[PDB]
Design a protein around this ligand. Sequence first.
Ligand SMILES: Cc1cc2nc3c(=O)[nH]c(=O)nc-3n(C[C@H](O)[C@H](O)[C@H](O)COP(=O)(O)O)c2cc1C
Ligand SMILES: Cc1cc2nc3c(=O)[nH]c(=O)nc-3n(C[C@H](O)[C@H](O)[C@H](O)COP(=O)(O)O)c2cc1C
Ligand SMILES: O=C(O)/C=C/C(=O)O
Ligand SMILES: O=C(O)/C=C/C(=O)O
Lengths: 312, 312
Amino acid sequence: MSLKVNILGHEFSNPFMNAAGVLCTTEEDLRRMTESESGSLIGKSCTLAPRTGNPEPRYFGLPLGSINSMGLPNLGVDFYLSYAAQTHDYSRKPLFLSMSGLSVEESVEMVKKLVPITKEKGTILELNLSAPNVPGKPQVGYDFDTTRTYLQKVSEAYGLPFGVKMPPYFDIAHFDMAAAVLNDFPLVKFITCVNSIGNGLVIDPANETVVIKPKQGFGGLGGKYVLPTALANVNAFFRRCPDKLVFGCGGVYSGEEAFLHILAGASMVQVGTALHDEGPIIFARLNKELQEIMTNKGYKTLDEFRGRVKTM
Amino acid sequence: MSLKVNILGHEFSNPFMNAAGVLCTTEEDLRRMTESESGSLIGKSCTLAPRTGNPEPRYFGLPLGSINSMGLPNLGVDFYLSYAAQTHDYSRKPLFLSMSGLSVEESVEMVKKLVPITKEKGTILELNLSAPNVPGKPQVGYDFDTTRTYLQKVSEAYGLPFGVKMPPYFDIAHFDMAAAVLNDFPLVKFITCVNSIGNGLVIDPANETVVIKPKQGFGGLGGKYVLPTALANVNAFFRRCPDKLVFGCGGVYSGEEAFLHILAGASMVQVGTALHDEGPIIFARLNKELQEIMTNKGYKTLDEFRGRVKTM
Ligand SMILES: Cc1cc2nc3c(=O)[nH]c(=O)nc-3n(C[C@H](O)[C@H](O)[C@H](O)COP(=O)(O)O)c2cc1C
Ligand SMILES: Cc1cc2nc3c(=O)[nH]c(=O)nc-3n(C[C@H](O)[C@H](O)[C@H](O)COP(=O)(O)O)c2cc1C
Ligand SMILES: O=C(O)/C=C/C(=O)O
Ligand SMILES: O=C(O)/C=C/C(=O)O
């Protein structure tokens, strides 16, 4: 029995990694992820210059998940590049970096810096097209013309295989249009589905007040709220983008949800809210739980059921 | 103390009504809603000719809500017009009709028939711009150019105050764009936020199969999944559309959620999944619970706290 995943010319011990933004901002964060049982890890979505992000409170834990408006707090691209170039232990696991420049110009400058590091070390890029908590910046993934520009310029500047973190879509026509754009860019080798359900609003009945400070209380929703949306997006892109991998993100708290993501088409499974709650010990637990389910089903490898969800 | 809502010249005993699609397809259904403690009721979203809808199974109750791909099963516009003109007891409560033509031309034909009945009986129109379960038809509300055509043509053909049932939005830019369209049509007097979270996917880990037959398992999500999205949309349009009422729909299981919708800016509060689960007796419970909360906080009327959510 094996949880191994072989993608992007790399071997992964298991399909699990952190979702970007969770346990991946500081060197301590990245060390802890690297020391974890996780199959991989990804750095915080970064910008050219550092950011401290939005004012507090900017995160609120909920019964059914989380709401956040972090605002892309990050140590700046130079920090993540230096981690990838000289700190990270690649013998432990592969490393992804999320890049989230707030303009095509910023992104282009950033991805150009990664090229030598990718060539030397094998560091993988995930382009963030779904930043929902920066005031005045729309989610790029909801604008297909802007998305096309980013993919074009990054394809030219970076010129190596990379992935995209997509916002959740809720309409068949949008699946179609998103896939049509993604399928024009052969360097896009994986799609991460999905980012937070953007711009939700939580109000505390007791004090009649929103629970987070930025953007009048509007923030991205994670956790149990997003599982059906995540599964749909994973499966939709899995079918529409056969020449690309899909990474599953959203609602993973146990082996059962991981199993569902993989059945829907996920190669890798990312863990956000649950990891924030439980810390890196979750990855040991997820490995155990997924193996239990596989044992019960009489499956030896992930390839026995990846993308094999049955319809009626 | 008073749960009363006074809008469009009508007195509503309370703000509660069924969401379109739940307990409102047949005469029996409509009778039970009229006999219930609800402040109002809305007829099933209808088409010019009858529809039987999607194949079974097309509805699945979930721990956290519901998934459905009903496909607009309805008795045709003549049935609902006839109910509105001949059968409905207006002394019990006002009646809304939802109209969901699958083309602007179909919509125009339908609303023209309603004009004489609205003038004589006071029947209120809700235009469905968010049907997510018709194979091959995108949700109109996600196309601002198409939405503009529907509102133009319906405004001209109907010529009387009406409302729109909007899909949920997840980006600030979409709130802005949607509002910019709605604010160009003075006859649009209310906005219902929100329809189902479209095109989610539920898989049963036990049999590795989707739980609904149509569209490879993809259906609209309702219930606890949609509360924060609903509150966000209600609040976003409450602030952006001062010349219009906002009706809340999504995640209402109790007086507490109803209170939150109203605090966010809702005039009327619609109940879908919870009503399907519990039956029309729910309205008696919702009235009681909302009254208790208002008593506890010292509010004598909904007007004292409608749209008065506090931010930091
Ligand atoms: C505190 C926090 C910070 C996040 N930061 C990022 C980020 O920097 N980049 C990104 O692409 N997604 C970010 N996300 C979204 C997650 O990567 C993930 O898509 C989302 O939380 C859904 O997964 P979950 O249900 O496991 O939480 C963040 C989420 C949280 C809760
Ligand atoms: C079985 C079912 C049928 C529905 N039919 C319609 C419909 O015909 N027209 C419509 O505008 N919305 C329809 N909806 C959406 C609901 O009106 C409502 O917006 C959604 O369920 C979210 O509210 P909830 O969280 O209370 O379920 C339907 C939902 C369900 C569950
Ligand atoms: O840092 C945040 O605000 C979230 C980023 C994201 O979801 O991409
Ligand atoms: O009848 C349905 O499938 C759904 C209707 C709606 O969501 O508007």
